[PDB]
Each structure stands twice: as C-alpha cells, then as structure tokens.
Write a protein that binds this ligand. Structure first.
Ligand code: NA
Ligand code: NA
Lengths: 931, 935
C-alpha cells in the first residue's frame, strides 16, 4: 500500500512528536467532518498522540492531510482554482475518491496528502481507506481487533489512487435477530435506538458500504428513535426496508388499521403509505414497492399493477412540491416467486424501478437479468443470505458460507449486470465478520477479487487482524470450518449424516475436525495477549464449535449402532456425546465471558435438537443408548461395512470384496457380551486369505482381527473363503471373504489415470489430463469451492449456449478430458456433483455433454427432473447431482466433458462400476497411475 | 372314585389301628413285588402306619389287598380256580388290570380288594391306581405335592374297574438337558446313574407310562451305570433311543472308530451295532433303525435311498443273527424307524421299508405333527407312533425355559394321531422334565385312553389335576391360572418375545396385554396367601412361578418398547420406562432365586436356563438386560405433542399429524399427550375447529408431568359423510400444533342394541370362530368347539375326524358339508378381505391340503387352501406366531350379511376371523371381537 512505517521522503503523518495537521472545511458535509474526526482519533489509537483538526490552511503545520468533497470544500476548490489539483477523473462520479500527494499546496505547507471525493460518501471512503492503512481495522471495536502501535507513519510521494464502486448500493440486512442480537442490544443500549445504530453506520462506512435494511422482527426503525433516520442520513447510510415492507413502513407499524388487503382496505393502506413516504422524505432512501397481500392469476397481476400505480401516484404527490419527479425518486421491487412468472408473462414494471433479484434463501441466486432487461434505467440487484429462518430448516447459529461459494454466485451477478444493489442478510451480524467484509469488498469492485484471489482474501484478512506470522494457518482454519459447515448446516446435522459403514467417512471427518481443533487451540497460546479476544471470536470459537457439533453426532451414531450390535463399548460413546454436548455449552459461555462479557448473548441461539424447520427453545442433549453386560463369556463379532453383528438370524456375514487397488486391510471386531474371560481361535480357510492373529483372549476390551489378501497366492477371477472364529460356544462364527482379481495386477506406478477400486472411480473435477479452450472460453478452477477440494466452471461468463457436440471429436465448446483405468468391463454410471444453481436465465437449463473415447456424446441437464423436493435436497446437501450411463471394456479410457449452458459448475465425479456404496461426500479420490 | 374316608361296609384298608394286609406272591414278577412295597410305604405316608406285606394266605388279617399277575400269581390263580374271581376281561391283554372286591376270598379273610393284571405292568399300574386314590400324587416327590393324612381308608364294595391302554408304548425323552437338569442331576446323584434313573422310572409307572429315551447330549445310558438298563427292565420301563441313535447305541458311544459314514466305514459300524444290540438283548427294548450319515447332504437322492435300504438290510441281518440263538425271528424283535423330512419323501416314492418296523412320525419340533398314517399304511403290522415336542433346541429359535404348550393344543393334534391310528408309540420331548409337569401328565393320561379325554374335558383335566394336588377349594382358580399363562406363552415363546411383539400403536394391544398379565399375577399372589403352608412349595413351582415369570418377561419388553418409542418422540417420560425395564429384569432374576431356594434348595439349577437376550436360534450364555434409551431435558419450556396411533411426535418435518378416524361404533375417546422437553413451566391453549369435535380441556400448564387431552365426537352435531377439522394446541412457540381429526358417519346411527351381529368399527370386523349364529351338521359331521384352544379364546373343527375330503361346493345351493354361519353389519360398502387364523397344521395326508370354502349371503363360494403358498419361511412364521393365516376377498354392500364357511379337508381348525373393510392396522393378535348387536 501507500503507508510506510519509516521515513521515505513523502508526507509525514507522524514521526515521534511531529504529527501532520488534518484539514477539513467547516462548511463541508457534516458526515465528512465526522469521518475526519474519526481519522483524528484513529491516529491517536496508532500513535498515542492526537493530531490537530483545522479548517484554515494558515493554521496547518509543515505536513497536512487535506480532506474534502469537490462540491462543498473550499479547500479542494482553492487547490483546483490554483491548479494544484485536478479532479476531472472523479468529478460527477458516484462515490469516487482520489488520494494524491501535493507539494507546497499553500505557503506554510511543505507536503499534503489530499483526500478528494466526488460526493460526501466518496470523501468518507477515502478517509476510512487511510484509517485502515495506518492500522485501524474496520473491526477494531466490532471484533476487538487490536490497533498495532506505530511512532512513524509516512505517505509515499508517488501515491496516486483513484477509486470508485462498481455496485451502486452495498450493504446488509439485520434479521433473524432474536434472541442473540436483540438481547445484546437491549443489554447495552436499551433498544434498537440511535446509540446502537451509529455503531452499525460506522462499521458500514469503514467497509466502504452505504446501505441498510434495519431490524424489523419486533422493531420499527423510524419510530423507536426519531434520531435513527436523522443519524443514518447524516452519516451517509442510505436506508430502505425488506421487500415485503413497502413505502418506508416497517412491518410492525401496521396495526389498528384493518386488514393488510388492497382489495378491501385500499384507502387505509394508501394513507398509511403516503404518511410513511412523507415522514422519511427528508432522508436518502430507496423505497420498497408493491406488496404481498393477506388472504386468480390475471386478477393478481392486475391488482399488483393497481397497487404499484397507486404507490407511484403517492410518490409523485409527495415529491412534486419538493421539486422531484417520480422518476428521480429511487424505488425498488423484488419480483419474487410467482411474481417473477407474472413478469415473464408480460406484467408491466416502470423502467426506472430497480429489480431486486433474491437468492433461494440458501446462497443460490434464483434469477439474473436478461440482455433486454439490462437496458432498463433502474438496473437490477441481488439480495443474498448468510442466515435464514424457514425451510427446509433454519440456520441461525454460526457462519456456514464459504467465501468461494459467494465468489462464484456474485461473479455471475456482476457479469449479468445486477449491479444497482447488493445486500446480504447477515442475521445477527456477528459471527459473519469475514464473509460480510468479503461480500462488501467484492461489491466495491468484483474485478479486484477474481477467483485466483479467494484464498488470498482470507490470508490478507488474517494478516491485517493478527499479523503475518500465523496468517496462512489462520486463514486455512477459517476456510476449513466454513467448508465443513458448507457440507451441511449444524442445525441439519444428525447421527446418520456421515457414514460409519462406508469409505471410513465418519472416521475421516472426525480426524479432520480434531486436527483443525488442535491447530486452533495451539495458536491461542502463541499469539500476543491483546489478540486473544479477536482470535477467540473470529477463529477458535467457530472452529471448535463447528467440530464439536459434528463429533457429537458421530459419537451418537456410534453409540446407537454399537448398542444395536450389543457391544458394551457403546456406553463409552454415550459418555462422549455428553462430554461434547457439555463442551458446546462451555464454548458458548466462554464467548459470553471474554473481554469482561462484552459479547454476552451473541451465541445464545439454540442449535441442537431440531425436528422441523423452526428452532427448539433450548439445546437438548441427543438421545443415547445404554448397553448392559451379562456374566458368562459370550462372543460377538462386528464386521466392517455391516450393521448386524454376529450372531444374527437370517444374515449373511461377509466383508466387502477385496480388490487389487482398493482397501487392503479390513477389520473383524471380537467382543465380549459378558464379564468373564473370553478365549477364542481364528483361522483362515484359504492360503491367499490372511488374518493378523490365530487366537485371542479378552475380558472387557474388544479385539480387532485384521484381514488381508496375499494376491500372489490368489488365482485369477473371483474367489471366496471364510474366516472362522471359535469362542466358548460350539457354534463358530463364519465370515465370508471375497477377492476379485480379473487379471495380472500391474503395479500402480505403471498404470494410466484414475484406477477402479472397490466398485468405483472417483476424482475431483480439476484433476484433468487435458483441457481444451475454444473461442477464448475455458474450463477453469475455482479454488476452495465446494465440499471437498475445488470446482471447475467455464470462463469468461457467457450469456449464450454452445451447440451440443455432434460426435466425440467435435470441438464445439471447451472440454475437460480425464484418464481412467477400468478393471470391471460393463455398464458404468458417471455422477457429477454440481453447485446447486438455478435457471438464472429463463428457459435455459444447466446442460453439459459427456462421452468416453469415440462413443456418441450424451447431453445431461443438471436441472432435468427438477422439483421442490429435489431443490430441498440440493440445499440440505450443498450440491445438485446428475448422471449418465456408459458401457466400457476393461482397460484405459478417456472421459470427455463438453460445456453447453453457462453457470454449470462441477466439483467432483464419481463413477459407479457396480459396487458403489452410499456416503455423504463420496469416496476420496481414486489411486492415480504414474502418468 | 372308589376310596372313602369313612366306614362304608367295604374293604377296610385302614381304620385307626387296624390296617389291611397286603398280599403278593413271592414267585410273582419282581417289578410287581417292588410296586407292592411302594404301596406299603404309600400307606404309611397317608396313615402314619405301615401295613404288613406277606405271600401266604395264612398270614392275612380279616381285610386284605390281593395283588398279582394272572400268569404268575398263585393267589390270583387260586381265586380264579374257585370262581371267586373272573379275569376273562383282562386275560391275554396288554397292560390291563382289574380292581374288584371279593367276599370271603379265603376262610380267614372276610373281605379283599383284588388287584389283578394281565401282565407285570398291568398289575403295577393297578397298584399305583390305588396309591393315587388313597392320596399319593405321582408328583408327591417330583413337585412336592403333599399327601393328605387319613386315619380311615375304605374301598367301596361295588368297585369294579377294568382298565387297559389304547397306545401300546407311552413315555418321555429327557433332552436339551444342560444346564438345568444336568447340573441338578450332578449335584444330587453325581451323574445320570441308576440312583437318578430309578426316580424317573417310578414317576413313569405312577403315571401309567412305560417308555423312555434317556439323556444323550453328554451321557450314554448303558455305559454310565450298567445298572441303568438292568433296573429299567426290572422296574418295567421299556428302553429305546432317539431316532438318530440306532441299534441301542447312544450318540456318545461312537468314538475312536472312524467316520459316521456307511459308504466308507460299514464294517466298523456293523460290529458296533452288533455289540450294542447283543449288550441290551436281555432287556425289553424297541430298537431304533436306519441312520443319518455325516455326508448325506453331498449325495444324490437316488444314492441316499439305495444306501438307506443297504443300511437297514444290514441292521436286520444283525438282529436276526443276534436273536436266533435266543428264541426270536427278526420279525419278533420290536424295531422303529422315524422317516424324517426328505426320508418321508423317499418312502412315498418307493423306498423299501420292512412291514413289521414301527413308523415313528415326528412333529415339526413345534407341536404340529408332520405326517400321520394313511389307510394303506394302517395295514402294516408294525403300526405307527408320534414323537412330540414340549421343548426344542434349533430353529427358528430355541425354546427351553418354561412351559409354553397349552393342553388344548396337545389335545387337538394327539386326537388326530389317535384317529389316524398312530397308536403304537407316543413319546414326548420333555426337555428337563420340570417345569412341564401338567402337560406331561396330560399327554400320558391321553395316551392311556384318548376317549377318556375328549375335547369337552380339556378344562376339566386341569381342574381335576388342581383338585388332586391342592384340594377342591381353589381348584378352578388354579386351573385357570395354568390355562392363562400357557395360553399366553402359546402366543409367542418367551425366547422369541421382543419390544415389537405387542403393538403400542394399534388397538391398545400392549396396554391390554399388560393389564391382563398384571391381573393374572394379582390372582396368583392373592391365592398364595390363602393356601395351606404345606402346599406352598408345590403351588410355587407348579403355578405361581410360571405365572409371574411369564408375565414379567412380556411386561419387560412392553416397558422396553415404550422406552424406545417415547425416547424417539423426545419425551423425558421415556426414562421411567427405562427404569421399569431394569426392575422387571431384576424381578425375573429374583423369581429364579426363589425357585432355587424353596424346600431347602431342593430344585436348585432347574430355572438356570438363559432366556433373555436371543439374537439367533441358539441361546445366549447368560441373560442380558435389554438396551434402553436415555432422554435429556433442556431448560426453557418447549412443547411436544404425541398423537395416539402415530410414532412421530409433533413437531416433525414432512409428517401429516392426525388421530385415527372416528367411527360410530368404534373407539370413542382418543388421546393427545402434551409434554415438556424443558423444565420451566409450559402453558398452552387447546381449541377445536368444529362444533362436533370435543376436547376435554381448553388450556393447561405443566412442568415435569405430561397432560392428556381427550378427543371425542358429538355425533348429533356431525352431518352425514366424512368430515375433518383440527385440534389446535398453542404453546410458547409461535408455531401451533394442528392435529387433524376425521369422523365418518355414512348414515343415521342406530343404537347397537337394535343392530344384528358383529358390527364394523374402526375399519374391521373381528370375531371368534365359535361365535356362530348357526352350525349346520351334515351327514353326521359338524363344526364343534375346542375349548381353550388357540391364542385368545377357542377354536372350531369338524368332528368326527374324517380321512376323506368333502366335495367342494359347486355353488351357493350346495349342501356338501357342515357349515358355520356368522352375522355381521357392514357400514363401508366395497371390497373386504376375510382373514382366518388357523392351527399351524401340516399336510398330514400326502396330496391333501387344508381347504375350506367361504361366501357371503347367496354369493358363489370361493375355495381357500390354508396351505396355499406354503414354504419354509411361511412355516417358520407359523411356529413363531402359533397360527397359519389365509384370506379371501369379497365385494359387499352396506348392511347386514351372513358369512358362510363350508368344510372341505380334514384338520382345518380355525380360532378367529378378521375382516378388513379398508383401514385395518397391524397387531400381533388382531383386534378384540367387535361390538355385537343386540338383535
Ligand atoms: Na443468529
Ligand atoms: Na429347559
């Protein structure tokens, strides 16, 4: 950046006793003067010394910061008049600022940093740019991020920065606010009054945002404190309402006036709306239009048109005497659900009204502008969710939105030109600090944050708050817990989520999570003391809390399964459920206790015990089973991959089939259902079948027998034998083992591509062997996207579809090629895992084409078979799925994928060759041959 | 009876100081003299005085008992010579006896009871007939039944008893004997030696039985004590072996001689067999024939048949050779062969089976006889018999612990055996013997003469047995307790019971079963305190232990079921049901301790069989307390609602909450249960959305308790047709619970008394098979009631037993066969499904099924075969559940109908009909019988 912490011949903001003078015209915007005053205290935070703030150039010292708007600063204007400054690059622009150094701007001033803005907010944003660069995080108060001391602050002489936003209105919606934000606000401020809201306004400005929808569950912004809109307007925050709160009226303001129904109560509604728009007319707003009524298709469309027409006439009547026409008063309409269909079927919407497109409440944008809609003077915007109360189930507790998910969807919005308004539902605001800042930095300029800077954003954020030493590790912790929560909201997690039986999924997840926790715990003791509060609330708490909920359900799953199997070890897992549940409570209490209880109530959202879409009233520890012991030695055997334990009537006991490149060692677990010593023998029925022990003895512990194959002693083809385990009882346990060796087993080093094992071939979409670009379009990797690794998608963004390929050599579109080795000849099923995206362009699907070798390509639409139930499952799991069937010979093959429609974004491919088993995430990527 | 406890001018067996003299010839059979000595001691048990025992007429007093065999008593022979006695009615017969009074049999004797037998055992049985009549139960030792004291014993002067058995060989198999019998035997006798077996011999003779298969899991009768067979033969017990132990060799005796395989090891097997048969040749036996080799499974049917013919020929030659130097041809040496499973098929397809060998037909290990003789087979000189089970180790699951065989089940199957003439051998697997005392005696009394024990005396047997052991005052109540616990156990073996058996959701089944079991326990406990002190050991082991033990196991699984469901529903009350599981498991354990402690630990080990914790056919090594769930509470008030008939509790995503539909004659009050998942006070309101829908409360407040809301219909305010409304329950959360209620009133509701027959309600019509309106007899045949048969009430079957099928009725006018008619009232017009519950019987005559025909009103009859779709799996479920099922579909108008059932094939035995009119739900036993119209 442009700030140096040692002398550099530039502008001297601070150097020991010497501090630059801050200059702002007392006739400039009050909101800019206020921001200048914040810069004054910011510099004291950094240097320990308070710089002076003057309005007259004559009172300035040798070095100065000259702050002003082009329109109202006598300082900026004098510099322009005397050609010390040119503002042609910002003049007339929306929220632009220029930071430049000027030599001898005035006789008593040697050097000045000039901060010039096109308008009030432009100048404010330039001021807070400087605040952050000298070391004051936007989150210095809102997340206790310490301000690193500096005795020296210098501005580079060649500094020349010209900035302005790409999205015109950028901000947040405080929502889902009880119990957490609401009980904190009431404890600290009494209510959602202007002492609370000025803390919110300041945060938004420091993040270069300008837009707010206020808390409305049980509050009315303009009524609860008349200074709320006055201070919003003075600060520079543009106010609006959520999209079912029309005409500047909060939801709760409608009382004692009859039914919310325009067909029967229009006069009352119209007077209510008129007085609302009149009341807030002194302030900078965007007015919400239309309405959702309470209690025929052509009748609906007609009614909505009447309503909007009536609202337009109200606005005209209010603002006409104030010298404004209806087309000069910002207005917004969210065309939501059926209303979108109304609109596509020809409903009329005045051209100047902004069309706000909503996501699906789960981070997937439902609709974006078409080529013809982009011509509307009102433009369009996006309303996005980080938090939601509704179906299929609420998620309200901690951050569950990975940065890369945000990137991929908001980049589509940017490219399809929904750039009038970007607003995100932040729930209680905390603990969404990182994705809030990402969303708003992206809104400022999406081109400054391309997909190759997704990881870098998190690293840079961590470096700013905590310093460089552990920045990479801290960024990775955040990327890791958010990716994990992106797999399934904590509220939606349960015992059955991660598989105990297949591909060691629950065990792998538990280990991942535990390693994340250990990293987070360890750093707590290594960072400086004044970082601990910030670190706890921004990193350690969400990591430990996220891990604890999942581990709790995995322990529950084990308690339940092992109890069904009759294993007394089940009780130890029941004890683990209790410990993890208690740990969840202890973490919440810690969050409520740090920094003398500053953040008490913010983690009070219930998140354990959901049985339907709405939260329980409190956390409830999950149900556990209790296994009793007998007395005499009594043997059971648990078999890897199976729910029933031996002995069980009418069950064929078998280990999963061994394959040459699959899992090589599998477990039989012998256990005692009594207390007296249990002696047993173990024998194999074939020379190729190996067991790790020939006998054992146990009392209250279990014993694992490892089973494996000697492939050299196994004939070609499919063969079966038994492991026999003989305990005290005269009936021995016989566990069948099968091994399939279709041919001589070539060493993996000498194979090509991803190799079939254990009934499947699995690989990340980015693990291509070749990529072919066509007409400047190419499948490219989105780092850290999706549930397990990354995704691929076509860039640049098209607003047209490629032709499907006629044959498997057609170069109609960019392609991805993969290499595989198939052992099992026959029909395979290739499933892709995709971002759960919508048909954001009417009547256009999410098609791709796929073929092996020179077989005729098949067209697959990810959205084929779409339904409400299919959509529900796409947001519960975080992916959409699509598949195709192919017949292949044994040997090597090339899988080919062609792009067709835009916005198809694929993370993983899973090929079922016949024996694929269910899991939440799919098997981990297959063995890969040595080239 | 013929014994009086006051003077009556007959034979004075005892009167204070005066006792009759017992007379038996010292040249008569040793085993009869032995029985006479037991009578001497039995007399002392009753009177405290020992009668004298002499051989010489000179020594007798003025009253005497003269005991002898026709063939070897000089006493009996003299009486016959002088025409003081006639024995034409018993001479030459098998095991016959005669009890009569003779005046002045000799100069110094004024009166005598004469006990004359056609052969040794006939005489013995006569002796023990008298022992029992003076007051010594067969179970005086084996179940601690007290001997009532009497100072006076008189034989009525008109006594004239002539008895002989219908079944020639009658007895038991000690089996499944470890751990319980085996550990008791070892503690008391050291091993299965003659000190143990003479106790068994005596019991069998007192029960008028004569046949035994000995314990063979880890013992060899003839080897463990050489006196075993010596004393068996001397006492009069005919010895044999179980049907895979050929040629008088126990299973364990085969060791160190190579494979049990005739193809490769014939010479060793033959010598082994020859030595066995030679060893036991001095004793009265039936020799088990054939063999099951170790590798018969690997071999073709053709080869198996050839090999069996070879083996049996070789065995016959061995017997011929062994007995020729003795006085006997092979056709004079009793032999038996159980043609079992596929070997039965071998026989039906032409395998050679020598004509004089007795054919033993086994049951299916679950009390259903697999096969009985055909008309042509009854001509075979060897005859046929039945091997029956009271206990079994094997599939689908072992049952080893307590008595699970109701008397009426035994009656109906053994009666078929009798009428199809399998009367050469009746033998029953009794497991450890105890606690099968009542059904053992029943089986053996029936074997003695099935005609003395018709179905109309099934209840009476139990009452007479209770009266003998405990006296008349509470005999009927005691008999009812035994009938109740055995009926219940006949529904599902304790070993096979589990949480899911009895329904928590439908027809209040688990709650009703629990209450019936609790009330049975209360009767047993109340009676315990009323009986005399010296009857309490016998009462405990014969009545109270099995009653409480049977009840406790079922109640335990019901408590587990509630714990599991309520835990899934998130109800903290689940934890109290978890505690009940524990208490009931501990009670089971304590009852076992009590059984092992009575009478100074006399019966220690007999109840040690593990019976809780089965997961496959073979027992666990110890009882294991069932798994329970633990529910946790939150803090804040949080409302749930459990809905009667539904597993999910409110709130649950994607579930339509509704009470079962209300019908005019169905259940009138149904329950919504409001509960708190937290601890703080929970307030709520309750409202109905319709004037016809009534709720018992409009608001409530709970902390730790649940609250039931009763829901019901005001039928007068309900319009005709089907209507729905909601009960709305509003708690703390802003999301209210809406439970749908539906009521179906197809017409004006006539009072039940004005209706006729069984009335549709809640989607079904249900009634006992005996609840007929008419029972048409045809050609001397009639459907008749078997009392106490089946799972809930009784059964109906056609008698007399036929060995031919009626013609199926060609149409509604056909009077081909006896018919049962029932009356019903249907509210729901349309298709119905009529299911019958039947005895789980086999095709006991090859090529013949279990058909009946059924129709409503004048509609055409449909023929149903109960065995249609038969399979191993269908068989397994029939023995798990105790019934076979069959069904038919009919389309009926609303209104009154007559259901009609025609007999076709024999041995169709039906206990219950359940008609599904569209909404029948699953339950173990089916709904209780429907409301019955007054008309
Ligand atoms: Na929240
Ligand atoms: Na037993």
């Amino acid at each position: 950046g442009y700030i140096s912490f040692k002398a550099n011949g530039g502008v001297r903001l601070a150097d020991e006793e010497h501090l630059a003078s801050l200059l702002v015209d007392t006739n400039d915007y009050k909101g800019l003067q206020r921001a200048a005053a914040d810069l004054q205290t910011d510099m004291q935070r950094v240097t320990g010394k308070l710089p002076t703030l003057h309005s007259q150039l004559k009172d300035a010292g040798r070095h100065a910061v000259i702050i002003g708007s082009v329109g109202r600063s006598g300082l900026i204007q004098l510099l322009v008049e005397q050609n010390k400054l040119n503002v042609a690059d910002i003049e007339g622009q929306w929220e632009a600022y220029k930071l430049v150094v000027v030599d001898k701007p005035f006789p008593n001033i040697e050097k000045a940093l000039v901060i010039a803005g096109s308008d009030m907010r432009g100048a404010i944003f330039g001021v807070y740019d400087l605040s952050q660069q000298i070391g004051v995080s936007p989150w210095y108060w809102w997340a206790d991020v310490p301000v690193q001391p500096q005795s020296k602050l210098y501005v580079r002489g060649d500094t020349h920065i010209v900035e302005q936003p790409k999205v015109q209105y950028r901000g947040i919606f405080l929502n889902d606010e009880a119990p957490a934000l609401t009980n904190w606000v009431h404890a600290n401020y009494g209510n959602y009054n202007s002492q609370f809201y000025t803390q919110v306004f300041e945060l938004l400005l420091r993040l270069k945002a300008n837009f707010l929808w206020p808390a409305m569950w049980n509050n009315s912004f303009s009524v609860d404190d008349p200074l709320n809109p006055v201070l919003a307007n003075e600060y520079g925050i543009v106010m609006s309402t959520s999209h079912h709160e029309p005409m500047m009226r909060a939801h709760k303001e409608w009382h004692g006036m009859g039914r919310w129904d325009f067909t029967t109560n229009a006069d009352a509604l119209k007077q209510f709306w008129r007085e609302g728009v009149e009341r807030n007319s002194p302030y900078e707003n965007i007015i919400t239009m239309a309405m959702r009524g309470d209690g025929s298709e052509d009748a609906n469309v007609e009614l909505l048109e009447q309503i909007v027409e009536a609202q337009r006439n109200i606005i005209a009547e209010v603002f006409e005497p104030k010298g404004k026409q209806v087309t000069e008063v910002p207005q917004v309409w969210c065309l939501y659900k059926e209303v979108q269909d109304y609109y596509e079927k020809g409903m009329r919407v005045p051209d100047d009204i902004t069309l706000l497109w909503a996501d699906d409440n789960w981070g997937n944008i439902r609709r974006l502008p078409t080529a013809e809609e982009r011509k509307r003077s009102g433009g369009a915007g996006v309303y996005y969710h980080f938090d939601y109360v509704g179906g299929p189930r609420s998620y309200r507790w901690i951050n569950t939105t990975p940065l890369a998910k945000i990137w991929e969807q908001m980049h589509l919005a940017y490219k399809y030109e929904a750039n009038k308004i970007w607003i995100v539902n932040v729930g209680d605001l905390k603990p969404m600090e990182a994705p809030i800042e990402y969303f708003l930095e992206m809104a400022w300029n999406p081109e400054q944050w391309p997909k190759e800077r997704i990881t870098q954003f998190a690293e840079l954020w961590a470096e700013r708050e905590f310093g460089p030493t552990y920045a990479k590790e801290i960024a990775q912790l955040v990327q890791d817990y958010t990716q994990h929560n992106g797999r399934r909201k904590p509220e939606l997690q349960e015992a059955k989520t991660y598989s105990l039986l297949n591909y060691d999924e629950a065990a792998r997840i538990e280990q991942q999570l535990t390693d994340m926790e250990s990293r987070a715990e360890t750093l707590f003791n290594k960072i400086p003391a004044n970082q601990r509060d910030a670190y706890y609330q921004l990193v350690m708490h969400p990591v430990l809390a996220s891990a604890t909920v999942t581990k709790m359900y995995i322990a529950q799953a084990r308690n339940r399964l092992y109890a069904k199997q009759g294993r007394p070890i089940a009780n130890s897992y029941g004890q683990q459920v209790k410990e993890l549940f208690e740990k969840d409570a202890a973490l919440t209490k810690r969050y409520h206790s740090i920094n003398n209880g500053k953040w008490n109530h913010f983690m009070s959202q219930p998140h354990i015990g959901y049985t339907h879409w709405n939260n329980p009233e409190d956390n409830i520890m999950p149900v556990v089973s209790v296994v009793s012991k007998g007395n005499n030695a009594d043997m059971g055997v648990a078999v890897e991959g199976m729910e029933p334990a031996w002995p069980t009537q009418d069950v064929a006991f078998a280990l999963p089939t061994f394959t040459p490149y699959g899992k090589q060692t599998k477990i039989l677990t012998v256990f005692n259902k009594g207390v007296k010593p249990l002696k047993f023998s173990v024998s194999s029925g074939a020379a190729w079948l190996k067991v790790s022990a020939s006998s054992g003895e146990i009392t209250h512990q279990e014993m694992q027998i490892q089973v494996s194959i000697d492939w050299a002693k196994l004939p070609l083809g499919i063969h079966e034998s038994n492991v026999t385990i003989k305990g005290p009882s005269w009936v021995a346990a016989n566990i069948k083992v099968t091994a399939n060796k279709p041919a001589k087993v070539i060493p993996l080093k000498k194979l090509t591509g991803f190799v079939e094992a254990d009934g499947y071939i699995s690989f990340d979409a980015a693990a291509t062997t070749h990529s072919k670009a066509v007409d400047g379009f190419e499948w490219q990797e989105i780092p850290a996207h999706g549930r397990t690794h990354s995704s691929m998608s076509v860039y640049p963004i098209r607003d047209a579809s490629f032709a499907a390929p006629a044959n498997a050599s057609a170069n109609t579109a960019p392609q991805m090629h993969y290499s595989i080795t198939l052992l099992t000849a026959g029909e395979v099923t290739v499933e892709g895992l995709f971002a759960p995206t919508w048909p954001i362009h009417p009547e256009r699907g999410l098609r791709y084409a796929i073929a092996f070798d020179d077989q005729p390509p098949q067209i697959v639409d990810v959205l084929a078979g779409n339904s409400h139930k299919v959509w529900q499952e796409s947001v519960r799991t975080g992916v959409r799925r699509a598949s195709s069937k192919h017949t292949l010979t044994a040997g090597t093959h090339t899988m080919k994928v062609w792009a067709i429609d835009p916005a198809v974004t694929v993370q993983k491919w899973i090929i079922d060759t016949g024996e694929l088993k269910p899991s939440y995430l799919g098997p981990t990527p297959s063995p890969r041959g040595g080239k």
